[model samples]
Target: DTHPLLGVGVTDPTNGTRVWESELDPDLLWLADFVIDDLVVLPGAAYAEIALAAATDTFAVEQDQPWMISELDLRQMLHVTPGTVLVTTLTGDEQRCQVEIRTRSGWTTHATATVARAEPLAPLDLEDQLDPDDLYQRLRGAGQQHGPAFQGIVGLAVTQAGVARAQVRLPASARTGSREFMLHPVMMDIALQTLGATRTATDLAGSALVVPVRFAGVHVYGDITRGVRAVGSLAAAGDRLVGEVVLTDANGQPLLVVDEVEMAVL
Candidate 1:
C-alpha cells in the first residue's frame, strides 16, 4: 500500500478486472530528471515496474523469485503531467497477466505487457576499462538531456565484439524514495543505457538518438541499489537494434537480466 508508483484499488465492476490508479506526482518520484529530446520521457523500465506490481497484486506470485516482464510493448511516450491519473489494469491468471496502463483523461493506452516468473542467466565477463569522461557530453549532443539523477553510468568498457560493460550507480537524489519500487526505474534504465555503447558503426553514423521501444524476458535476480554493472550486447535489426543485457554486482553476481530489448532511432 505504501508503494509510490501504484496502490491497490477496487476491481472493475463491469468485468472483474483488477485496477489501480495513482497520481503522477513529480515530487514523489524522480520523474523530472529523465529528459530526452526536451521532454521528460518515461523510461521503458517504468512499464516493467508497473507490470510487475500489477501482476503481484492479481496473481499468487512467489515471493522468493523475482517476477519478469516477458513481453513489454510501449505504445506511446508519457510526458510526466502533474495531477494526471495513471490507470493500470490486470486480466489474467497466476501463470501470467496482461497488464495495461492508460491516462484517465482521454483513456489513451500507453503500454501493454505480460508479466511472468523470471529466469536467471549466466554472468558476463568484461575486462577492458573505458574512459567515461566525455560519454555524457556525447549523449547530450545526440539529444539525450539526462539530469544528474539519471546520469548513472560512471564507468564503462567494451569488447571488440561490441559487448559493453558499465558501472552504474544511482545518485542519492534518485534513490530517496526508490526503496518502495520492486525495481527502481532509474537504475533499470541506467542498466539499459549500456546498450548505447553496443551500437554498430553504421548505426552511429546514421542515427544519433535512440531509445528502447520494446523489451522481452526482463528478469531481476538481486538488488541493484547497492551499485551494479551492466553487460550488454547488441545487433542491428533492420531499422532497429536488439540487445541482451545483464546487471551484476561488483563480484559478478547477476542482478537483472534482459533477453531482448528493441530500440529505435528517433
Candidate 2:
C-alpha cells in the first residue's frame, strides 16, 4: 500500500530524480482540525515528513537507523484548498539531495530540504510537572484555537529555567497519520507544542500566535504510533524564537531529534 501521505511515487534512475504525488483533499479530517486563526495552513511538520519520505524513497536507509534531515526550509506557507495537487520532488544522490514540494496544478514552490547521514544524541532527563490544560488554555487565548483532533499534549513537565518535557498522543481523527506517515506530522507537532512553555512570560504575552518556520536538523530514529515524550527549550532569536527538541518512545528510546527550529509569530 502507498503511504497515505505520499499518495504515489515516480522516480527516474537515469537522471536521479524522484517524486511523490498526493492531493489536498478538502475532506481530510486532520487538515480541518489543524487551523491557525482563520486559515487552514499546512503544518511545517507535514513538509518535514514529505522531505523525509522523499529521501527514504531515493536512498537505502535501514529500519533501525534512518537518514537525518540536514536542513529543511519552509520557503512558503501552503494554504490548503479543494482540488490542490501536491508533489514532492527529490534530486541528487545518497549522501546528499534536494527535496521540494510544489502544487502540481497551479505550480507553486512550498518547501525545500536537504538530507544526509548523522548520529543520535543522548536522551533528555526531566522532572517537575505542569498542567497540560493550562498550556492549551493559554494557546487558545493567543488565537491558536486547536480543535479536539489537534489537542494531543496530555502531560507536561517544566522547570523555572524553562526546560520542558511533554507527553503526547494523537487524537482519534489524527491517529490515522500514524498508519500512513513514517513519522506522523501531528505527532511531530505535538512535540513542537512543548515550546509553548519554553517562552518567557513577556514573549508569550506579546505574540498572538507562534508557528515553526524552519528546522535546522532533524534526526528521525524510528516510526511511532501512539505515545512519545518530547523535551526541549526555546530562546528568543532576535524577533523570532529558536529551539531544539528530542522525542522518545515509552522505553526512553530516541525517536527523533529536532536540533534547531526557527519560529515566528503570526
Specify the highest-TM-score model's number: 1
151-235 in candidate 2: lDDT tens per residue?
A: 8889888876878888888788886645546667888888888888764533577547777778988887777554578887988
Please give the RMSD of candidate 1 to the true structure.
2.4
Q: What C-alpha lDDT does candidate 1 achieve relative to the native structure?
A: 0.78
After superposition, the stretches of candidate 1 with alpha carbons farther than 4 Å from their true spots are 120-128, 199-207
Lowest-sum lDDT 10-residue window in model 2: 198-207
TM-score of 2: 0.89
Clashing pairs in 2: none
lDDT of each residue in 173-254, candidate 1, tens digit only:
8878765677778888888878767647224844378778899988877676655788888888998888898888889777
lDDT of 2: 0.78
For residue 264, what is the lDDT in candidate 1? 86
Pairs in clash, predicted candidate 1 = none
- Candidate 1 lDDT at 149 equals 83
lDDT of each: 0.78, 0.78
